[PDB]
Amino acid sequence: KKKLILFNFDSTLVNNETIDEIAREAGVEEEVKKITKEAMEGKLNFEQSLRKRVSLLKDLPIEKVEKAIKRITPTEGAEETIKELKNRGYVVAVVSGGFDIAVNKIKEKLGLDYAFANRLIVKDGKLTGDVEGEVLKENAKGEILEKIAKIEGINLEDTVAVGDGANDISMFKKAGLKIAFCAKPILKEKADICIEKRDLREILKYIK
Numbered sequence: 001k002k003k004l005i006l007f008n009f010d011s012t013l014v015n016n017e018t019i020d021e022i023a024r025e026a027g028v029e030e031e032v033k034k035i036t037k038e039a040m041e042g043k044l045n046f047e048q049s050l051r052k053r054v055s056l057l058k059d060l061p062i063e064k065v066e067k068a069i070k071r072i073t074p075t076e077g078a079e080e081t082i083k084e085l086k087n088r089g090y091v092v093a094v095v096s097g098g099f100d101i102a103v104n105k106i107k108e109k110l111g112l113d114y115a116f117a118n119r120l121i122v123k124d125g126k127l128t129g130d131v132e133g134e135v136l137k138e139n140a141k142g143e144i145l146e147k148i149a150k151i152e153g154i155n156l157e158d159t160v161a162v163g164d165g166a167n168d169i170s171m172f173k174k175a176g177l178k179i180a181f182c183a184k185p186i187l188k189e190k191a192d193i194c195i196e197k198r199d200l201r202e203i204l205k206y207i208k
Contacts, residue, residue, distance in 0.1 A: 002152060003208070005085055005160040006145055008168050009096035009103050009117065012181050013110075013200075014072050018102045019053055021068040028056045042166030042186035046097060047136040054120065058129025062122060069102050074110075077201035082110050084201075088208045090160075091152050095141045097167045099131075116144050135167075142170030162203060163187055179203055 010017045023032035032053045039049035085092050093114035096103050100117045107115035118133025134140060141163075149159055161168070161175030164183035172178040172190050180191035181203065188194045195202045 001089060002154045003089055003158045004091045004149055004152060004154045006093045006095050006171060008163045008165065009094050009098045012162060012164050013075060013078055013094055013106055015075050016072055018098045021071055022057060022065055025064040025068045026057050026060045032056060040165035041184045046138060046167045050097060050131055050136065054131040055129045057127045060127040062125045072102060075198065075200055077199040079110060081200040081204060084204055093148055095135060095144050097135050114148055139170045141168060142174045145171050145174050160207065
């Protein structure tokens with residue numbers, strides 16, 4: 001046996017867009033949110049859009065980054081959904097184009113089995129304005145889904161992907177069940193199931 005379910009981080013497991021929250025601390029939230037929206041709608045190349053948004057955070061003090069991170073709250077039904085999923089024999093993972101500093105926290109908190117995300121480069125207690133990681137390429141999340149499944153010896157037909165943006169496309173491509181959670185048109189068009197109510201528990205009826 002064994003099943004696997006992956007979630008994107010921003011706006012799915014948590015209620016906010018990490019990059020937008022941090023940008024708010026840098027006084028550049030209007031340009032960043034506009035770019036985030038375009039990126040998730042699939043109107044921009046993900047990597048380029050992320051490097052462009054992170055560049056605007058150059059020199060931001062880590063204390064500032066932390067204030068933004070502290071504002072990150074879990075999406076309604078998050079804890080309950082994860083608990084029931086583990087109950088049904090699922091390996092639970094979070095794969096995000098976001099940042100480890102924020103994602104690892106929810107991994108710790110919710111007790112997730114796997115967490116993959118990019119990294120904000122920091123030096124002298126301040127962001128350098130650069131980002132690196134393996135969740136940048138268009139095919140990134142899909143390779144990660146496959147890699148986690150291979151490690152676990154889980155068949156792709158037994159994998160579930162829950163996303164909300166353009167960069168979740170490659171994840172859907174390899175997932176057995178594709179669920180778009182309060183997502184952008186570009187991803188909804190590719191989903192087996194579209195959920196419009198902001199409650200992660202809404203996915204459970206379709207799970208297992």
